[PDB]
C-alpha cells in the first residue's frame, strides 16, 4: 500500500533544485510553499531539497534532479519516501575540510570568491553528507564533509566564519564520481533516448524479472548517425 | 602595474635593428631620436638596440627583431623592461676570439674584408654577450666574446686594432644555434601563419593555463598544400 510513493521520472527543466508536485499533494502532507523535504535513501542517509508548487507545468509527476541522485544512491525505476519537516532550524556553525583529490592547480582562497556571491538570496539548505557542484574557474569541483555539527541544523547564513587546518583526509571508494556523464548531459534527442530508456532498464534495473519469465530479452543494439552525434556518450550515460 | 611594458608583436619590416614607437612614448622616457636603449633579460644579461621614432608606420606596437631574441631568451608572448641610457660612451679597445666550431673552410683574414667596409656610417652599438650575423662568403657566421672590456663601453670606432692569439676556446651548450629556422624565414603567408600563432602559443607558452581550465585544447593540426609550399618549414619554425 503506502499511497505516498513517487516514481522517478525524467526531468525536462535544466534548473538546480526544484521539485514539481500536484494540487492534491499539498493537502496530504500539509506542506507550505517553501518547506524542507526529508528523503530517506539507504545505508541510513538523508537528503534535503526544495519543493515547488505548480499546477500548470506538471500534472502527477516528480522532477528529481541529479544533485541528489548520487546523495541517496537512487536511480531510475526506484521508489522513495517523502516526509515534510516543518521544523525551523538556523545554522550558525559549519565545518569545511577539502580533500586532497582535486585541489591540483587551485591556489589561494576560493571560498570567499565562489561561495560568498552565490548563496545570497538563495537560502539553499544543506546537510552533512551532500555532494554539490559549483560553477567557477572554468570547471566544477565537489565538496564533502566528514565531521561537523549534528545533522541537520545546517543553514547557509552570513554569520558563519572560515577556518583552515592544513591536514587533508584520505578519500574512500564507497562513492562514485558525480562528474561522470549522466542523463542530463545529452540534449536534443527526446525520441531516440526514449526507446533506449524503454529497452535497457528491464534486464538491468530488474535482473530477477527475466530468470522467471520466458520473454526474449534484447541482446544487441545498433547505433547509427554521422560521426560526433554522441553515440559513445549515450552508451556511457545509459551504463 | 608598471605602465611601461611592451608586448612582443610580429615584425613586418625586413630590416636589421630598428624599433618603432609611438608619439606618447618619447615624452615618458624623455628619449631623443637616436639613443641607446637598455633591455633586461634573464640570468643577469643586457642587450643594446637602436630606437626609431615614427608616427605613420605603427601606432602602439613594437617591432622586436630576431637579432636580440636569442640574446635575451625572450620569445613571443613575453614581457620586457625598457630603460633609456643617455650616457655617452666611446669604445677604443675591443677583444676578438673566434670559436673553433664554424671556422672550417675559412682561410686568411676575414675581419679586414667583412667588418671594415660594413660598419662605416652605421655607428651600431655592441655589448659583451651579443650574437650577431654577417653577410659575406655566401653564408652567415656568428661571433661571441668571452672576455673583453667591462660592459658596456663598446662602440665600433676606427681607432680599434686587430689581434690574434691562436688558442680557441671550447663552446658550451647553454645557448642555441641562432642559424636555425625562425619566424622571419617564412614569407608570403600572412593569414595562414596567423591561425597557427593564435592556436599554438596557448598550450605551449603558458602550459599552466590549461591544467586549471576545462577548455578543450587543440590536439591535432592538419597541414595542406602542394609539395614544397613549406609545410615542414612552418612546423620547424613554430616549435
Ligand atoms: N547530443 C549531444 N549532447 C551533448 N554532447 C554531445 C552530443 N553529441 C556530441 N556531443 C559531444 O561530442 C563529444 C564526442 O562525441 P561522441 O558522441 O563521444 O563520439 P561519437 O559521436 O562518435 O559517439 C562528446 O564528449 C559530447 O560532448
Ligand atoms: N614559404 C616559404 N618560405 C621560405 N621557404 C620556403 C617556403 N616554402 C618552401 N620553402 C623552401 O622549401 C624547402 C623545403 O620545403 P618543405 O616545405 O620543407 O617541404 P614540404 O613542402 O614538403 O613541407 C624549405 O627548406 C624552404 O627553403
Curated annotation (Swiss-Prot), chains A, B:
TM ranges: none
Superkingdom field: Eukaryota
Effect on the protein upon substituting residue 77 to E: In CMT2Y; increased ATPase activity
Record-listed Phosphoserine modification sites: 17
Cystine connections: none
Mutation effect (residue 140 to T): In IBMPFD1; uncertain significance
Consequence of substituting residue 135 to S: In IBMPFD1; impaired autophagic function
Domain notes: The PIM (PUB-interaction motif) motif mediates interaction with the PUB domain of RNF31.
Similarity annotation: Belongs to the AAA ATPase family.
Involvement in disease: Inclusion body myopathy with early-onset Paget disease with or without frontotemporal dementia 1: An autosomal dominant disease characterized by disabling muscle weakness clinically resembling to limb girdle muscular dystrophy, osteolytic bone lesions consistent with Paget disease, and premature frontotemporal dementia. Clinical features show incomplete penetrance. Frontotemporal dementia and/or amyotrophic lateral sclerosis 6: A neurodegenerative disorder characterized by frontotemporal dementia and/or amyotrophic lateral sclerosis in affected individuals. There is high intrafamilial variation. Frontotemporal dementia (FTD) is characterized by frontal and temporal lobe atrophy associated with neuronal loss, gliosis, and dementia. Patients exhibit progressive changes in social, behavioral, and/or language function.
Name the UniProt record assigns to this protein: Transitional endoplasmic reticulum ATPase
Organism: Homo sapiens (Human)
Gene name of the record: VCP
Amino acid at each position: 500500500n503506502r499511497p505516498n510513493r513517487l516514481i522517478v521520472d525524467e526531468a525536462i527543466n535544466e534548473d538546480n533544485s526544484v521539485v514539481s508536485l500536484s494540487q492534491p499533494k499539498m493537502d496530504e502532507l500539509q506542506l507550505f510553499r517553501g518547506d524542507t523535504v526529508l528523503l530517506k535513501g539507504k545505508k541510513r542517509r538523508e537528503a534535503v531539497c526544495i519543493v515547488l508548487s505548480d499546477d500548470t507545468c506538471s500534472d502527477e509527476k516528480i522532477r528529481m534532479n541529479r544533485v541528489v541522485r548520487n546523495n541517496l544512491r537512487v536511480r531510475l525505476g526506484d521508489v522513495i519516501s517523502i516526509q515534510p519537516c516543518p521544523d525551523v532550524k538556523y545554522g550558525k556553525r559549519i565545518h569545511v575540510l577539502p580533500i586532497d583529490d582535486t585541489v591540483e592547480g587551485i591556489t589561494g582562497n576560493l571560498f570567499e570568491v565562489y561561495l560568498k556571491p552565490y548563496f545570497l538570496e538563495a537560502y539553499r539548505p544543506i546537510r552533512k553528507g551532500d555532494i554539490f557542484l559549483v560553477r567557477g574557474g572554468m570547471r566544477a569541483v565537489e565538496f564533502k564533509v566528514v565531521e561537523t555539527d549534528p545533522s541537520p541544523y545546517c543553514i547557509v547564513a552570513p554569520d558563519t566564519v572560515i577556518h583552515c587546518e592544513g591536514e587533508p583526509i584520505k578519500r574512500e571508494d564507497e562513492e562514485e564520481s558525480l562528474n561522470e556523464v549522466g542523463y542530463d548531459d545529452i540534449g536534443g534527442c527526446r525520441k531516440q533516448l526514449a526507446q533506449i530508456k524503454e529497452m535497457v532498464e528491464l534486464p538491468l534495473r530488474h535482473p530477477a524479472l527475466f530468470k522467471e519469465i520466458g520473454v526474449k530479452p534484447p541482446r544487441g543494439i545498433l547505433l547509427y548517425g554521422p560521426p560526433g552525434t554522441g553515440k559513445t556518450l549515450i552508451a556511457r550515460a545509459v551504463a
